[PDB]
Structures are given as C-alpha cells and as structure tokens.
C-alpha cells in the first residue's frame, strides 16, 4: 500500500437484496432452469445471505 | 386408492396370465386361449397384438 | 555442447566414472500462466451486476 | 487431372432460374397429385 | 423474454390471405388490417397491395407516412444528440431503437443494416445474441434461408464462445422452428422434447402451439419406445394436453391402436396443417408418412392379414387399403405383399442375417471402389 | 534369426534386479530412470520392450550395474497394499448403523451415484465431487 504501488483501496460491504439477486444470476446463468424460476423469490427466502 | 390401482394390477396381471397360458405351445389357437383365459376372443387378440408390439 | 545452451537451471547427463556434462536432457517447463486468460470476458457487465 | 474435353458440358443457352430450390430431400412420391387425404376419408365413410 | 417483432401472427395472417382458399377471408383481412393500422408498417402495406392486386388506402396511407418520418426523424436526432455526447450505451440503446422501429414498420432492408451497424459497435455478448435472434426472427418471417443459416451458424459460435444457457434454450426452440420448416422433423422433434420443460420464447409462438407442434413432430420421428418414454408418459406433455382434447386424441389413438380414431384425427391435422404456414409446404409428407406409420405398426404383429380385417380397423372400404398397400409397398415402404385372389396381406420382412450380407457388400464395394482409386491415384 | 536373437537378449533380464521408475522418454533407445536407491539415470530401453507400457511413472526392472532399462514390471508393485476385502473388510453392515439416513444417502451417492449415471450431472451445469468431508463431534 506505499505510494508508487498499489495504494487506492475500495471497500465492499455485504451485499444488499438487490446485490444478491444478481449474484443469484450470475451464478446461477450457466445451469438448466425450468420456465417461471422466480431467483428474485429465491433471494426474498435467503436473507441476511453472503456470496 | 386401492381402487385407484386395481385396473393396472389387472392389466399386469392379464399380461402374466397369457404368458403362462401360451407358454407350452407352438401354433395355439387364440379361441383357446380365449376359453382358457376366460375373456372375449376380440380382447384376447388385441392384448396379444400389443404384447408382441 | 556448447556453453551457452548450459542455461541456469536445465537437465543434464553426467558421465559414470567422471561427471562430464555430455547431454542436455529435455526439461518440462510447466507453464502455469497461459490458463487464466478470459479474453474480453464477455457477459461481465455493470448492468448485470447492478447493484 | 483428364479433363474430359470431347465431352461437352451442357450450353447455358437458356439457363432458367430454379423454380424453387427447395432443399429438403425431394423423394419419388411428391410428384404424385393426390386428392386431399381428408377427402378421401369423407368419400369413404360416405359410400361405406 | 422477448420483443414480438416481427410480430409472426401478421406472417401467418399473410400465408392464410395468400391460400387461394382463404383470400376471401373478411374477418382475417380485418385483423391484418388493424395490426398494420396499429403498427405503421408503410413498407409492408406497400408490398402486401403489390402481391394481393388490393386497392390502396391513399386516406389512412398518408397520415401513415407522415407518422413513419416523425418517428425516424425522432429517432435520427435521438441518435445524434447520443454520439455527440455520450459514450457508448445511450448511442447503443438509440441505434437498437431505431432499427427496432424500423422492424416494427417493415423496412427489410434498412432493419438489417442497421441491425449489423448495431452490432459491429457492440461488444456485450448477451447484447449481441439478441441482435442474432431479432436477425433470425426476420429471417423466420421473411422465410430468408440464407439468413436464417448465417443467423443460426453466428448464434452457435457466440454460444460457444460463452452465453446463458436461457439463451442457449432459445436458440434451441429457434433451430427447431427452422429444422420444421426445412422438413428436418428427427431434429425438430429432439430439440422440442429437450427444450419442452425450458421453454421462455413465447415471442414466436404460444405454450399450447409449442407442445402441439412438439407432439407432431414426436410422433413421426420417435419409435414405439421413445414414444412411450417422453411423448405419452411425458408429465409437463400430458398437463398441456389436458386442455387440447384432439391432440390428445390424435397421439394416444396412435398409441392404443385405436386405428379409425387415428385416421379421423389425422384428417383434421391435415387441414390444420395446411393452414399453419410453417408446416403447409409439408402437410402432405406428414399425412402420408404418419400413414405408413399405422399401417407399418398394424402389420408389425401380423405374420398373416385380411383386407377385411384391415380395412375395419380403419373404418375404410378394401379397396383403399388394397391401393394404398399397393403404392406403399411399390414405394418400398411397408414390408409386406397383397394376395387378391384370397384377399390376404402375407408379411414379408427381410430375415437380419440377409439384410446385413446385403448391406456388408454393398458398404464394402464402396469401401473397395474409394481404396482402389486411391491405389490408381498414388502412381497416376 | 530376429526370433532367435530377441530370446537371447532376455538374459539381460536375470533374476537378480532392481525395481525402478520410469520418468520420461528422452530419444527412444533412451530414457531416465529413478532408481529405489535414491538416485536418477539416463539410461538406455532394452529394444524388445514393448513402449506402450511405458506409461509415466510406471514400476520398471533395472540392471543391477548398468541400471538399464531392462523390463517393465507388472501396473503396481507398491508397498501401500490394498484392502484384502476377505479377512480385512469390515463387519459392521448398513443396518447395523441406527439412523443417519441423510448421511447414509450423501455419502452412498458422492462415490457412488457419479459412478451411475452421469448423464444427468452435466446437462444441469453442476460438476461431480471429486471427495466428501465427513466431520462432526467425537464419536
């Protein structure tokens, strides 16, 4: 963290429901779901949840 | 629910039932198996014509 | 064999009876590092990692 | 290569456009001018 | 998930209109006319008057046009109020616009280049496989094989490159809806049964035409065991059909052997066939193999047959069968020879033991003739 | 005369050998070879060695002195043995564990589902298990 280094620092706090609904998505993208996946219900039953 | 069940357990057992009638034979008659089985000549034919498909 | 293909840290035979350098065995490199390349990453945007 | 020269290739005199080109499988049967299947059936049943 | 442009109910509209039978049709004009009226699609209108000798509505056409140019001209100062500020996105979003309008309207031509400007500037790949799909659904409506081969080929290579496999399902149900139209019904029926229960595009067509579709399909390139495995024991299947009594008519007479049934509904398919502007160029092909289909089920159990016998069980007269038998069995279809002076169907398959010799030779005298031109070839 | 003089050259195979490993493949006629001594070699193969054994890291037979590569023993020799599974396995049945159902299924289907099957695992995007972690309290 010295200057001339990598020094600029960003925080990042647990994600908030709308943030877990799109890492819902991204992980989720790449897997055979069926028609009406409602991830946004999913996200409302896992609060308080991390990546 | 027994109830529910009874017509494939009859089927099944339709099936089971010509197998064994038919067994000891070569060029059996499907009168006689009608009258050993105890069911219409038409119904016997048809099952059988499923059985071989 | 020529000096300048006895490189730092490269195979060699030695002899039996006195250890004379006469061979240059192959050597696995393992490159560990042409593996993690994602190109453009496509599908990592800002509109869906909204939030 | 032995380019079969003494034998002409077709001329391009007319050379018409396909008519359709579809490529599906063609098949002998298509050809046929049948009488609208259904039909048949009604004519059927009627005349038993 | 997606937009209804094209709208393919106004292809259809124009297939039925263009059927020498239904040209007539008052109701059918009557709902074409107010999509265009609701649409502005200047350009369709035009080119529906040339190919249907129809009068033109200089009074609507007018304040159509005046309308056509307000919006494009909207969209032309949209555009450049983007590109002269803003970086990427909005000039984006306003070039999607604008072409998507311009589908909306009708303009082939312009869509197109539009839609390739759009996405040569591009770079998102999700971005990119919407581009192909509107290119495919054009491609759809406009029956543009060319395009629709090029479109299908860009949409697998951006899949494999990396995509959502929503997107991947999608392009399966499109694949489908082509391989249908270019009388690949193997393919058709394979990416229907694998894309049934992941099914979102409903901008092409409705749940309840999609598992019609996908039945009719099923039926004449899945076998007995297929068949049974996923068509008729299929759960989400069976669930849709509930609601469509003659679908489920038409596959489990076929499957019960219920054989005047069968006939009766494939009678109504036909019609219904011919009318789906998909499926009309093959509602022929269809009828008559989904005929040799039940007459090659019938006999698969019947060493020996009565023309009687056969003909009450399809409810038909004996000499129909005799000359459909006839044909077929010319034709190489059905295994099996007619004996008239005794009207009696004698099967005839071929033992396996012959059949492979057969085909053992015939395979190795191809195999033969390629290794003795190479042979040939390696000296002169 | 070939058939003759590849039986004579196994007497370079006599009984008296050391096991080895074999590494890598340098030119064919060539190769190195680690000895169970603890040391490395650039070693010659015997020619009548059929090379499709050769796979890395495979029990090899060298000379005594030379340490050629001289015979390609048996996949394993090994000193790790393998359970007996006739006087060493176990007697302790399924039914002899009281409950533990959900475990039971878990751990039945991470080794042996993966080895049925397979062709459901992939179509829904997720990866079979390489192992599974049995942990909780003592006993």
Same mark, same amino acid.
């Given at each position: 963290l010295r200057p001339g280094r990598i020094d600029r620092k960003i925080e990042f706090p647990p994600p908030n429901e709308e943030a877990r609904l799109d890492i819902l998505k991204i992980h989720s993208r790449k897997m055979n779901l069926t028609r009406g996946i409602n991830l946004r219900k999913i996200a409302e039953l896992m609060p308080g949840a991390s990546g | 629910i027994i109830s529910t069940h009874l017509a494939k357990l009859y089927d099944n057992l339709l099936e089971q039932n010509l197998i064994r009638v038919i067994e000891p034979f070569s060029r059996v008659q499907i009168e006689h198996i009608s009258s050993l089985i105890k069911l219409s000549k038409a119904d016997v034919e048809r099952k059988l014509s499923q059985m071989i498909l | 064999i020529d000096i300048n293909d006895v490189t730092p840290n490269c195979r060699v035979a030695l002899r039996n009876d006195s250890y004379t350098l006469h061979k240059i065995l192959p050597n696995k490199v393992d490159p560990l590092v042409s593996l993690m390349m994602v190109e453009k990453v496509p599908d990592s945007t800002y509109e869906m990692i909204g939030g | 290569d032995d380019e079969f020269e003494e034998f002409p290739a077709e001329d391009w005199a007319g050379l018409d456009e396909d008519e359709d080109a579809h490529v599906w499988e063609d098949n002998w049967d298509d050809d046929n001018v049948e009488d609208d299947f259904s039909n048949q059936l009604r004519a059927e049943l009627e005349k038993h | 998930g997606l937009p209804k442009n094209p709208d393919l109910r106004i292809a259809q509209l124009r297939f039925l209109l263009s059927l020498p039978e239904h040209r007539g049709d008052a109701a059918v004009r009557d709902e074409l006319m107010a999509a265009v009226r609701d649409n502005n699609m200047a350009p369709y209108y035009e080119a529906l008057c040339k190919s249907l000798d129809w009068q033109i509505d200089v009074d609507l056409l007018n304040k159509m046009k005046k309308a056509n140019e307000d919006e494009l001209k909207r969209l032309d100062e949209e555009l450049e109020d983007a590109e002269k500020?803003?970086?990427?996105?909005?000039?984006?979003?306003?070039?999607?616009?604008?072409?998507?309008?311009?589908?909306?309207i009708g303009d082939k031509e312009g869509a197109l280049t539009a839609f390739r400007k759009t996405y040569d500037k591009t770079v998102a790949?999700?971005?990119?496989?919407?581009?192909?799909?509107?290119?495919?659904?054009?491609?759809?409506?406009?029956?543009?094989?060319?395009?629709?081969?090029?479109?299908?080929?860009?949409?697998?290579?951006?899949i494999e490159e990396g995509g959502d496999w929503d997107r991947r399902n999608r392009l399966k $149900?499109?694949?489908?809806?082509?391989?249908?139209?270019?009388?690949?019904?193997?393919?058709?029926?394979?990416?229907?049964?694998?894309?049934?229960?992941?099914?979102?595009?409903?901008?092409?067509?409705?749940?309840?035409?999609?598992?019609?579709?996908?039945?009719?399909?099923?039926?004449?390139?899945?076998?007995?065991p297929d068949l049974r495995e996923k068509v008729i024991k299929g759960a989400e299947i069976l669930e849709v059909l509930h609601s469509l009594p003659a679908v489920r008519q038409y596959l489990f007479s076929l499957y019960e052997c219920r054989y005047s049934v069968f006939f009766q509904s494939l009678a109504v398919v036909e019609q219904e066939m011919k009318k789906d502007?998909?499926?009309?160029?093959?509602?022929?092909?269809? $009828?008559?193999?989904?005929?040799?289909?039940?007459?090659?089920?019938?006999?698969?159990?019947?060493?020996?047959?009565?023309?009687?016998?056969?003909?009450?069980?399809f409810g038909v007269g004996v000499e129909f069968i005799d000359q459909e038998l006839s044909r077929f069995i010319a034709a190489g279809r059905l295994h099996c020879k007619i004996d008239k002076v005794n009207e009696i169907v004698e099967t005839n398959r071929p033992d396996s033991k012959n059949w492979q010799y057969q085909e053992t030779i015939k395979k190795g005298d191809l195999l033969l003739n390629r290794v003795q031109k190479l042979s040939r070839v390696i000296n002169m | 005369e070939f058939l003759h003089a590849q039986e004579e050259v196994k007497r370079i195979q006599s009984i008296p050998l050391v096991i080895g490993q074999f590494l890598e493949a340098v030119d064919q006629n060539t190769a190195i070879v680690g000895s169970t001594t603890g040391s490395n070699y650039y070693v010659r193969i015997l020619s009548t060695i059929d090379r499709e054994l050769l796979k890395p890291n495979a029990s090899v037979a060298l000379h005594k002195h030379s340490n050629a590569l001289v015979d390609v023993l048996p996949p394993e020799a090994d000193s790790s043995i393998m359970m007996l599974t006739s006087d060493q396995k176990p007697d302790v049945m399924y039914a002899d564990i009281g409950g533990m159902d959900i475990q039971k299924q878990e751990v039945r289907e991470a080794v042996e589902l993966p080895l049925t099957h397979f062709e459901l695992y992939k179509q829904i995007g997720i990866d079979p298990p390489r192992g599974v972690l049995m942990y909780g309290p003592p006993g």
């Open positions: - | - | - | - | 500020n803003l970086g990427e996105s909005e000039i984006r979003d306003a070039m999607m616009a604008k072409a998507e309008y311009l589908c909306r790949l999700g971005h990119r496989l919407d581009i192909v799909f509107y290119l495919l659904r054009i491609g759809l409506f406009y029956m543009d094989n060319d395009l629709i081969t090029r479109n299908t080929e860009k949409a697998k290579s951006l $149900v499109y694949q489908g809806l082509y391989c249908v139209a270019i009388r690949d019904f193997k393919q058709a029926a394979e990416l229907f049964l694998d894309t049934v229960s992941t099914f979102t595009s409903y901008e092409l067509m409705d749940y309840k035409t999609f598992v019609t579709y996908t039945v009719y399909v099923s039926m004449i390139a899945l076998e007995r502007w998909l499926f009309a160029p093959h509602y022929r092909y269809y $009828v008559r193999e989904m005929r040799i289909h039940a007459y090659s089920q019938l006999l698969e159990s019947y060493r020996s047959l009565t023309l009687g016998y056969m003909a009450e069980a | -």
